[PDB]
RNA sequence: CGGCGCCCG
RNA sequence: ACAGGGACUG
DNA sequence: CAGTCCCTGTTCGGGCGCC
């Protein structure tokens, strides 16, 4: 007889599959003689057993190394068993962000020892565990055994651990409503607004409750260690910060340097306000090798500079005070880049961040703002579970005009205007109705698919005509091109009539920036003009002076 | 201790592994208090990591209600139980339900908590109550009883339902009663006073047979269809003739007897848009004959039960929305318009959420089926707030669309 | 070896 | 990598 | 009809930021 610590969680196998039988795979020759002994230890503790006949099971060994150890950590490879083992609902959905934590007066960390080997494996599944690994080099053929607990590198070790531990904690917690716990791996962090000593009262009383379940809590445990260092974070009960960031000063610039660079800037951007990656990010476009050589442009360096000066002075985040409102304010940073700060009390920030993503082939500041506002709302719901007060560089009339004209359903939640320049504006509007006393340019364009060759032009009510030959082009590009001409050759006020569904779709969505130089130019001409009217008439319907410019360019 | 109707994921497909989306703290409180109380009632119970299945859940308050109703998005499960409900047991859809002067919708879903569920199936109803900021892990449950909003729940309860109702149908034969998922549709030509009385009465029926029921009226006899109509003009600019002609070209995709010939000829030279061109008589008559073909129905558009319905919504501006229901292009089963819905003039997503609900509703009263939406919205916008404005116990299917406005010409 | 988050086909 | 829409091929 | 492309916008295989 062995003994029985804590409730076991049933595990099946993907129906119609069975335990593995495998040949060994290389692992370093020196440390493994040690486990021959360590194995006998486990025999006595209940973490191992053996039987001769019943196991058609064998597993190899493949491992991962960790820095900062005063002792070596053993491993075994169940990968064949793994692939053959039922799936679980993973318990780690990702991790809480510091800015979502409430400030807690007292916060301690107990690190659970022998955590994975402290959890009973499912009785009947125990069978599938049998394994073998080289003695020192090797001499005689060998022997084998079975596992009584959660094995290293097994899938359920993490799932079942997390759940069992949680299951254990539930009754302490129900008995202690005003404590606050969080579990990451084998470490537990506990915190309260109670007084420092009675807090330590419950800290021992809990090391008690864990012991009552066979869970070890050493005294290497620290009330005196905080800040706790966790995943790039430094956490004190009063204030949090990113762990110190080292920005490369290298004279030599390879694309992998710029990569690590960018990732680092964004990670800084969660806390240090106003980080810009745009120009550094332009270098990265369409490169074959991660080891290639790239020079830095002047803009990207003036930016890298401003950023280095951002990192110069230190910074810290506050924590969330659920009693008080959440405020998120976005300032337009230009080049389709955006920044935001979320604070409650002014100038004490919970966090910052960037939204730079240029979304779409042609876009504008209203669309893009709407996007930043959505990103932030989503993030806010993840962390604080609520939506912020918006402080937005946009007049309530700017915005109203946009969302109310636009064909898509679009919305920003409750928000208030902040008059911080540059302010977001609509750079042109298309008229909703034809313009009296403007020339009417009937415009068309066509190209030939085979030759990729073509022409763009127009006819007007005034007799004015034009046709321009174009090389290496498409039907679409010519229809944009003809509308363009009609913009160029027209007065301040002009009516433009086009037959292209494509072109009309772009312009009518009022882009202020585009990937396409021709659209940028169209946009530019558009801003200059006092009034524009875009009209659509079906092709080859024998329309208007539309049949005429269609003839003119199809020739 | 009563039987349990075994249930099966139609052959080949696994249980829903679909992920739980992040919730507001508000809604997480309401869900926690509802599941702990419902666990206490043994409707649901806690589960472990051995059940690797999930259905997403959130919560809503029904229209005009300050009490929180839990809502599970069982769409994925319903897709994976489907052959079971559709192929095994069919439910005839009353064609008269739509003709009734009033139709009330009562939420009977609570009754579903009576019947047990096949112990072998329960592992597929697994749903996570999320935690804010991932401070705790999820509280995972699974449904012990017949889970609200799964298509099997209204299916399996069919016998019992037809039973409890048989007294009323027998006493009131002229009253039409239809059932779609967690909702029950009841309608009659009675004057509203006595209708509401017959409704309170039916409420009693299900009340004494052991059910609780936390206005709902619809007026299907009043539902109007929006036909396409060409403008009435005193005097015509060129531009008018052009937009007219373009529209005519579309309608001619729908009604084939349309001709643009004489209006096109009206456009003959290269003319200023705003110049005023008089209507020739031959054209005046082609146009009036067109205004005619547009008062007709469309030959050969009829509902085919086997086909999925598809519903398209266009945003027309200024609180207006147009919609069209069809199973196949250009053969439209219904066209319509909504205005001054909640959110009008301030929040588009709200209005749209409303439109999707009203449309699904007419769709259920008429064909007994929820439509597939094409939503004139960005995917992400929609996911964020659609979860915020939802008052219905069901969830239609949707996909996201971009059609800068030339079909916006479904209304002047 | 993975999870989580961005950038390129 | 996948889909929707346009337009041209007899 | 299918069968061609031209243009545009969300899922998966490369690599950096955090374990
Ligand atoms: C790393 C971590 C993750 C999640 N929560 C906590 C912690 N540890 C803390 O440093 C912490 C700090 C301040 C307040 N709560 C904290 N806690 C909460 C549990 C009391
Ligand atoms: Mn053309």
């Amino acid at each position: 007889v062995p003994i029985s610590p804590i409730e076991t969680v049933p595990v099946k196998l993907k129906p119609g599959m069975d335990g593995p039988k495998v040949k060994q795979w290389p692992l370093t020759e020196e440390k493994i003689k040690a486990l021959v002994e360590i194995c006998t230890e486990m025999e006595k503790e209940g973490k191992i057993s053996k039987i001769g006949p019943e196991n058609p099971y064998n597993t190899p060994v493949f491992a991962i190394k960790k820095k900062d150890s005063t002792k070596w950590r053993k491993l075994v490879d169940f990968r064949e068993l793994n692939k053959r083992t039922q799936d679980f609902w993973e318990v780690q959905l990702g991790i809480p962000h510091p800015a979502g934590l409430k400030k807690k007066k007292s916060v301690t960390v107990l690190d659970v020892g022998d955590a994975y080997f402290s959890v009973p494996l499912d009785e009947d599944f125990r069978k599938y565990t049998a394994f073998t690994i080289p003695s020192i080099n090797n001499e005689t053929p060998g022997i084998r055994y079975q596992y009584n607990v959660l094995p290293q590198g097994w899938k359920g070790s993490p799932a079942i651990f997390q759940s069992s531990m949680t299951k254990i904690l539930e009754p302490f917690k129900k008995q202690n409503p005003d404590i606050v716990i969080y579990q990451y791996m084998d470490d537990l962090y506990v915190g309260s607004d109670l007084e420092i000593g009675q807090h330590r009262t419950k800290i021992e009383e809990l090391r008690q409750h864990l012991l009552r379940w066979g869970l070890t809590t050493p005294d290497k445990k620290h009330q005196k260690e905080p800040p706790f260092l966790w995943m790039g974070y430094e956490l004190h009960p009063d204030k949090w910060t990113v762990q110190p960031i080292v920005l490369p000063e290298k004279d030599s610039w390879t694309v992998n340097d710029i990569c690590k660079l960018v990732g680092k800037l964004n990670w800084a951007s969660q806390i240090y306000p106003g980080i810009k990656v745009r120009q550094l990010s332009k270098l990265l476009r369409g490169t074959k090798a991660l080891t290639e050589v790239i020079p830095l442009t002047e803009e990207a360096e003036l930016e890298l500079a401003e950023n280095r000066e951002i990192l110069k002075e230190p910074v810290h985040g506050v924590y969330y005070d659920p009693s008080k409102d959440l405020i998120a304010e976005i300032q337009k940073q230009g080049q389709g880049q955006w920044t935001y700060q979320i604070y409650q009390e002014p100038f004490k920030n919970l966090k910052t961040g960037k939204y730079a993503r240029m979304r779409g082939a042609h876009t504008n500041d209203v669309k893009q703002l709407t996007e930043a506002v959505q990103k932030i709302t989503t993030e806010s719901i993840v962390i604080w579970g609520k939506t912020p007060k918006f402080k937005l560089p946009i007049q309530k009339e700017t915005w109203e005009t946009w969302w109310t004209e636009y064909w898509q359903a679009t919305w920003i939640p409750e928000w208030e205007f902040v008059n911080t320049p540059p302010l977001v504006k609509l750079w042109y509007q298309l008229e909703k109705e034809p313009i009296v006393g403007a020339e009417t340019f009937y415009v068309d364009g066509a190209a030939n698919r085979e030759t990729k060759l073509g022409k763009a032009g127009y006819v007007t009510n005034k007799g004015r005509q034009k046709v321009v030959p174009l090389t290496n082009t498409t039907n679409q590009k010519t229809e944009l091109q003809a509308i363009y001409l009609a913009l160029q050759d027209s007065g301040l006020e002009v009516n433009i009539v086009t037959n292209s569904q494509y072109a009309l779709g772009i312009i009518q969505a009022q882009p202020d920036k585009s990937e396409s130089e021709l659209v940028n130019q169209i946009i530019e001409q558009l801003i200059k003009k006092e009034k524009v009217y875009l009209a659509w008439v079906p092709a080859h319907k024998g329309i208007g002076g539309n049949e005429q410019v269609d003839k003119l360019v199809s020739a | 201790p009563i039987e349990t109707v075994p249930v099966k994921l139609k052959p080949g497909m696994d249980g829903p592994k679909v992920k739980q989306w992040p919730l507001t703290e508000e809604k997480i409180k309401a869900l926690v208090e509802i599941c702990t109380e419902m666990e206490k009632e043994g409707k649901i119970s806690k589960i472990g990591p051995e059940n690797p299945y999930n259905t997403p859940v959130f919560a809503i308050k029904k229209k005009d209600s300050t009490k929180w109703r839990k809502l599970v998005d069982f769409r994925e499960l319903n897709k994976r139980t489907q052959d079971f409900w559709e192929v095994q047991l069919g439910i005839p859809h009353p064609a008269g339900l739509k003709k009734k002067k009033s139709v009330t919708v009562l939420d009977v879903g609570d009754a579903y908590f009576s019947v047990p569920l096949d112990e072998d199936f329960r592992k597929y109803t697994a749903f996570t109550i999320p935690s804010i900021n991932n401070e705790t892990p999820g509280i995972r449950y699974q449904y012990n009883v017949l889970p609200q909003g799964w298509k099997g729940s209204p299916a399996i309860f069919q016998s019992s339902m037809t039973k409890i109702l048989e007294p009323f149908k027998k006493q009131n034969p002229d009253i039409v009663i239809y059932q779609y998922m967690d909702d029950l549709y009841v309608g009659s030509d009675l004057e509203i006073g006595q209708h509401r009385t017959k409704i309170e009465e039916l409420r009693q029926h299900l009340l004494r047979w052991g059910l609780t029921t936390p206005g709902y009226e619809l007026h299907p006899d009043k539902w109007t269809v929006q036909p396409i109509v060409l403008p009435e003009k005193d005097s015509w600019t060129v531009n008018d003739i052009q937009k007219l002609v373009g529209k005519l070209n579309w309608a001619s995709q729908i009604y084939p007897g349309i001709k643009v010939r004489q209006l096109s000829k009206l456009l003959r030279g290269t003319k200023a848009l705003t110049e005023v061109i008089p209507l020739t008589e031959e054209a005046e008559l082609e146009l009036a004959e067109n205004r005619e073909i547009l008062k007709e129905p469309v030959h050969g558009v009829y509902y085919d039960p086997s086909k999925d319905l598809i519903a398209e919504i266009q945003k027309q501006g200024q609180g207006q929305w147009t919609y069209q229901i069809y199973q196949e292009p250009f053969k439209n089963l219904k066209t319509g318009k909504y205005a001054r819905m909640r959110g009008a003039h301030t929040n588009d997503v709200k209005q749209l959420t409303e439109a999707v609900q009203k449309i699904t509703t007419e769709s259920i009263v008429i064909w007994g089926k929820t439509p597939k939406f094409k939503l004139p919205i960005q995917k992400e916008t929609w996911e964020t707030w659609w979860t915020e404005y939802w008052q219905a116990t069901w969830i239609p299917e949707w996909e996201f669309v971009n059609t800068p406005p030339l079909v916006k010409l479904w209304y002047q």
Side-chain angles (χ1 to χ4, degrees), chain A residues 2-555, chain B:
Chain A
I3 328 93
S4 11
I6 63 248
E7 323 190 1
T8 197
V9 144
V11 198
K12 320 181 152 313
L13 293 158
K14 313 181 173 167
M17 261 197 172
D18 208 314
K21 171 185 183 181
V22 199
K23 171 213 68 172
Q24 296 75 222
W25 193 249
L27 182 83
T28 45
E29 52 182 0
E30 298 175 13
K31 291 165 187 168
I32 58 186
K33 191 46 156 190
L35 62 75
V36 185
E37 348 159 323
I38 286 214
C39 171
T40 307
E41 294 182 0
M42 293 150 178
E43 300 169 29
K44 275 297 115 185
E45 315 154 11
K47 295 176 178 72
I48 273 184
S49 308
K50 79 172 91 182
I51 293 187
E54 317 293 321
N55 61 333
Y57 311 117
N58 195 25
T59 71
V61 162
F62 184 95
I64 327 126
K65 192 182 191 301
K66 54 191 217 314
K67 225 268 179 176
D68 277 75
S69 277
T70 61
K71 48 184 56 197
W72 309 111
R73 171 187 66 125
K74 182 202 175 335
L75 256 157
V76 175
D77 172 277
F78 292 89
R79 204 186 318 199
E80 287 308 297
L81 177 64
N82 288 323
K83 305 164 176 188
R84 289 163 175 84
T85 320
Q86 75 147 92
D87 277 341
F88 311 101
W89 199 223
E90 171 171 327
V91 207
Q92 285 273 181
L93 290 184
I95 42 186
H97 185 254
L101 304 168
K102 276 83 58 204
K103 164 260 148 198
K104 280 283 140 281
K105 189 168 285 185
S106 339
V107 172
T108 339
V109 53
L110 339 154
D111 176 275
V112 170
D114 244 353
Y116 262 167
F117 299 89
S118 282
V119 208
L121 179 55
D122 176 34
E123 201 67 271
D124 330 36
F125 198 122
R126 274 170 172 179
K127 52 193 285 323
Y128 302 92
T129 54
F131 147 84
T132 209
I133 201 198
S135 93
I136 166 69
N137 216 279
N138 252 98
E139 283 94 22
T140 38
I143 213 51
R144 265 212 303 268
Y145 86 116
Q146 85 165 0
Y147 237 113
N148 304 331
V149 281
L150 302 192
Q152 319 306 121
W154 187 53
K155 306 159 39 168
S157 335
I160 308 180
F161 185 170
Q162 271 242 12
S163 65
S164 64
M165 166 76 65
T166 299
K167 226 164 178 161
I168 290 180
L169 272 51
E170 179 188 339
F172 175 105
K173 278 197 186 204
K174 194 185 174 178
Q175 285 158 350
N176 303 281
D178 293 334
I179 324 290
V180 163
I181 316 177
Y182 169 76
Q183 45 207 317
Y184 164 84
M185 309 247 203
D186 62 308
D187 308 16
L188 300 214
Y189 307 58
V190 196
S192 78
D193 278 11
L194 337 169
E195 52 103 356
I196 312 199
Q198 182 192 8
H199 158 96
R200 226 170 263 95
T201 302
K202 294 249 181 165
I203 304 287
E204 190 57 32
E205 156 184 20
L206 183 115
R207 302 170 59 186
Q208 281 282 73
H209 194 53
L210 295 199
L211 232 38
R212 182 185 179 221
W213 268 252
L215 296 148
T216 86
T217 43
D219 212 281
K220 192 48 217 287
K221 64 138 287 179
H222 20 275
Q223 88 222 20
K224 61 188 189 295
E225 259 288 357
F228 303 130
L229 303 58
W230 175 71
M231 321 180 118
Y233 288 103
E234 279 178 27
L235 296 82
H236 329 76
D238 65 310
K239 52 192 264 176
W240 72 274
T241 174
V242 296
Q243 283 168 12
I245 313 211
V246 215
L247 253 178
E249 216 174 33
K250 293 199 50 57
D251 56 331
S252 317
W253 291 117
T254 165
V255 276
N256 189 248
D257 284 13
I258 296 312
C259 244
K260 192 183 97 181
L261 159 67
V262 170
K264 266 188 184 179
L265 298 205
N266 304 310
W267 167 269
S269 70
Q270 59 183 321
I271 194 43
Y272 286 108
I275 273 52
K276 300 141 286 189
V277 83
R278 171 43 81 80
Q279 304 272 1
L280 297 176
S281 276
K282 285 161 65 167
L283 299 172
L284 307 171
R285 297 183 213 177
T287 295
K288 174 76 175 60
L290 177 64
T291 47
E292 288 182 37
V293 43
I294 292 294
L296 299 192
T297 165
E298 170 182 328
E299 287 75 51
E301 277 158 332
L302 186 36
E303 183 198 68
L304 181 38
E306 299 171 291
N307 284 332
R308 280 224 180 90
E309 201 220 277
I310 298 173
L311 285 216
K312 278 191 51 188
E313 294 145 15
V315 83
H316 79 263
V318 320
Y319 287 97
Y320 171 40
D321 186 342
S323 71
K324 318 220 299 263
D325 250 326
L326 240 188
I327 302 260
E329 131 164 35
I330 294 143
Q331 316 99 25
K332 191 214 170 174
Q333 257 200 343
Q335 311 304 294
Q337 301 184 99
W338 294 71
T339 40
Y340 63 100
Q341 295 79 32
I342 327 196
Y343 54 58
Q344 298 197 270
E345 301 267 2
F347 275 66
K348 327 169 198 168
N349 278 332
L350 282 144
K351 54 168 297 143
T352 73
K354 48 191 308 291
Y355 171 70
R357 181 200 153 203
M358 204 273 244
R359 171 171 196 151
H362 326 267
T363 172
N364 67 15
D365 295 330
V366 238
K367 274 167 261 172
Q368 254 162 351
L369 179 49
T370 302
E371 274 138 54
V373 140
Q374 256 110 249
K375 167 169 179 8
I376 276 131
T377 290
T378 288
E379 187 173 86
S380 265
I381 299 207
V382 158
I383 288 181
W384 308 289
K386 58 179 296 281
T387 287
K389 194 55 175 199
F390 270 109
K391 293 185 160 9
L392 293 181
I394 181 184
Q395 219 68 21
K396 285 255 178 170
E397 182 220 331
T398 333
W399 170 253
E400 219 247 353
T401 306
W402 167 250
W403 83 261
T404 50
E405 308 303 2
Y406 198 53
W407 57 261
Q408 217 166 4
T410 186
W411 190 63
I412 307 207
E414 172 147 63
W415 71 282
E416 94 173 47
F417 170 15
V418 63
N419 182 304
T420 299
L423 294 198
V424 164
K425 81 193 265 217
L426 281 191
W427 291 109
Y428 58 95
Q429 283 145 78
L430 314 170
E431 285 264 335
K432 317 219 217 167
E433 280 272 305
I435 303 99
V436 287
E439 253 193 279
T440 313
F441 290 53
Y442 287 49
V443 0
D444 209 343
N448 164 210
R449 159 228 286 293
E450 189 203 24
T451 68
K452 335 280 175 174
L453 251 75
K455 70 195 49 189
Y458 63 76
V459 152
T460 83
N461 55 258
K462 289 215 166 311
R464 156 175 334 212
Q465 304 202 356
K466 168 135 88 200
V467 166
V468 178
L470 304 121
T471 36
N472 166 33
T473 214
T474 95
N475 225 269
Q476 286 128 303
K477 317 213 178 183
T478 73
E479 286 134 0
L480 283 186
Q481 188 75 46
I483 268 157
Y484 182 20
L485 287 184
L487 298 145
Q488 320 201 229
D489 304 339
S490 72
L492 276 185
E493 285 187 348
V494 58
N495 270 331
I496 295 189
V497 172
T498 186
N499 105 84
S500 147
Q501 296 195 68
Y502 167 69
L504 200 93
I506 289 114
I507 298 157
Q508 241 164 214
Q510 318 206 134
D512 57 59
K513 188 194 146 184
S514 179
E515 304 164 27
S516 158
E517 245 303 311
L518 173 55
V519 197
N520 288 330
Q521 297 175 328
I522 288 187
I523 279 166
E524 162 213 283
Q525 265 302 291
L526 270 171
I527 307 176
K528 246 174 249 171
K529 310 280 154 229
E530 225 126 75
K531 275 134 163 242
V532 178
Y533 187 53
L534 227 12
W536 186 89
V537 300
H540 317 110
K541 263 329 162 173
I543 277 190
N546 183 71
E547 201 192 303
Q548 275 75 330
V549 62
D550 191 275
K551 233 183 177 176
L552 270 126
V553 280
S554 297
Chain B
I2 68 180
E3 322 315 297
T4 92
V5 185
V7 188
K8 335 204 171 186
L9 279 63
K10 49 160 141 191
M13 290 186 297
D14 196 11
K17 293 206 178 192
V18 36
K19 199 187 328 177
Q20 168 73 358
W21 62 74
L23 289 172
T24 54
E25 154 157 50
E26 148 178 319
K27 252 175 274 264
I28 301 201
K29 305 311 154 215
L31 283 205
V32 130
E33 157 202 50
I34 294 161
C35 305
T36 62
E37 180 62 7
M38 262 174 59
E39 168 186 25
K40 151 161 186 159
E41 304 161 67
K43 296 188 188 167
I44 23 174
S45 67
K46 282 193 212 118
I47 88 181
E50 68 276 34
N51 179 346
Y53 288 152
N54 205 42
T55 280
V57 67
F58 68 102
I60 95 181
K61 301 205 198 183
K62 294 189 53 171
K63 178 152 303 289
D64 269 308
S65 155
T66 217
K67 306 297 157 172
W68 294 110
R69 168 184 230 255
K70 168 208 199 161
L71 178 51
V72 215
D73 181 285
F74 265 134
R75 264 168 315 159
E76 201 56 22
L77 198 105
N78 307 334
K79 297 163 187 169
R80 298 164 194 259
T81 303
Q82 183 170 62
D83 166 60
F84 157 107
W85 35 279
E86 284 191 30
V87 159
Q88 179 180 325
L89 312 178
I91 309 186
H93 179 79
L97 171 53
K98 38 186 197 221
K99 304 171 154 288
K100 294 282 140 300
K101 283 223 166 134
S102 321
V103 168
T104 319
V105 192
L106 274 179
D107 181 10
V108 320
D110 239 318
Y112 296 50
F113 293 115
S114 286
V115 193
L117 186 106
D118 184 47
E119 189 189 2
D120 321 322
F121 193 41
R122 293 160 190 225
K123 67 198 166 204
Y124 300 99
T125 63
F127 73 90
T128 316
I129 268 197
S131 70
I132 290 149
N133 200 26
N134 286 7
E135 272 142 5
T136 346
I139 307 214
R140 332 210 29 229
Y141 286 48
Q142 84 196 31
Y143 259 108
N144 287 329
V145 313
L146 295 202
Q148 264 174 174
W150 167 49
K151 309 250 193 159
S153 269
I156 302 179
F157 190 92
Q158 184 61 288
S159 46
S160 332
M161 171 48 139
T162 205
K163 181 149 312 192
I164 303 153
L165 284 185
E166 168 206 318
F168 201 2
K169 298 133 152 178
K170 197 179 170 181
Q171 179 187 338
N172 277 86
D174 287 345
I175 269 184
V176 183
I177 318 225
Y178 174 69
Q179 176 181 7
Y180 185 108
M181 299 278 343
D182 304 27
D183 276 342
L184 209 76
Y185 303 85
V186 167
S188 78
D189 286 58
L190 284 165
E191 171 265 329
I192 164 181
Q194 321 167 225
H195 183 93
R196 303 217 217 194
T197 323
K198 240 93 172 50
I199 284 282
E200 203 78 76
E201 182 192 324
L202 184 36
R203 214 149 175 171
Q204 282 329 290
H205 251 73
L206 290 111
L207 199 138
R208 282 139 33 195
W209 250 92
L211 182 44
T212 84
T213 317
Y216 329 60
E217 330 122 23
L218 318 184
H219 268 46
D221 85 274
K222 271 176 204 301
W223 283 348
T224 45
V225 136
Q226 152 87 85
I228 303 168
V229 170
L230 322 158
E232 204 87 326
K233 299 244 76 189
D234 31 285
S235 157
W236 302 86
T237 53
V238 202
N239 175 223
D240 300 348
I241 327 285
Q242 282 164 12
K243 298 194 305 201
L244 177 37
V245 168
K247 190 176 217 138
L248 288 146
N249 208 44
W250 176 264
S252 57
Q253 288 203 257
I254 292 139
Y255 300 68
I258 295 164
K259 287 94 173 176
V260 301
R261 310 285 103 109
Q262 263 273 314
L263 305 187
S264 209
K265 261 213 328 203
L266 254 190
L267 280 179
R268 267 309 178 81
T270 302
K271 323 179 209 172
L273 287 169
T274 50
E275 153 172 307
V276 174
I277 89 97
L279 290 206
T280 80
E281 269 338 285
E282 311 182 331
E284 186 60 83
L285 314 192
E286 174 193 63
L287 162 93
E289 209 296 282
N290 270 317
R291 269 213 191 82
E292 175 121 73
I293 313 167
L294 279 198
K295 306 194 220 75
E296 315 298 349
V298 185
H299 174 59
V301 320
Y302 50 65
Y303 171 81
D304 173 337
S306 68
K307 314 186 151 172
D308 325 75
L309 288 152
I310 287 258
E312 284 178 32
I313 305 189
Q314 311 115 358
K315 158 192 196 182
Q316 283 279 13
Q318 283 195 357
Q320 305 241 41
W321 301 69
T322 36
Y323 64 102
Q324 303 91 22
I325 323 224
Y326 60 67
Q327 300 160 294
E328 295 225 344
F330 298 95
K331 321 269 196 42
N332 279 342
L333 290 169
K334 174 183 219 255
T335 53
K337 197 175 67 167
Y338 299 158
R340 313 209 267 187
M341 302 179 298
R342 78 246 191 74
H345 304 319
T346 168
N347 178 339
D348 269 336
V349 157
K350 189 185 220 144
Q351 264 160 136
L352 181 62
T353 311
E354 209 62 15
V356 172
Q357 294 171 194
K358 314 170 105 219
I359 291 176
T360 285
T361 282
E362 2 204 332
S363 153
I364 279 178
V365 174
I366 295 163
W367 314 281
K369 189 192 312 192
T370 50
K372 238 202 129 151
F373 279 92
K374 317 190 146 197
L375 296 182
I377 212 174
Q378 201 96 355
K379 172 187 152 62
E380 301 78 1
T381 297
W382 186 257
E383 262 136 75
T384 315
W385 291 298
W386 90 270
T387 323
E388 283 301 287
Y389 309 91
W390 203 251
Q391 275 147 334
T393 53
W394 29 251
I395 301 163
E397 288 282 16
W398 54 62
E399 57 179 56
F400 303 108
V401 155
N402 58 286
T403 293
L406 268 200
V407 200
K408 229 213 232 193
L409 281 315
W410 268 114
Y411 121 121
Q412 296 263 214

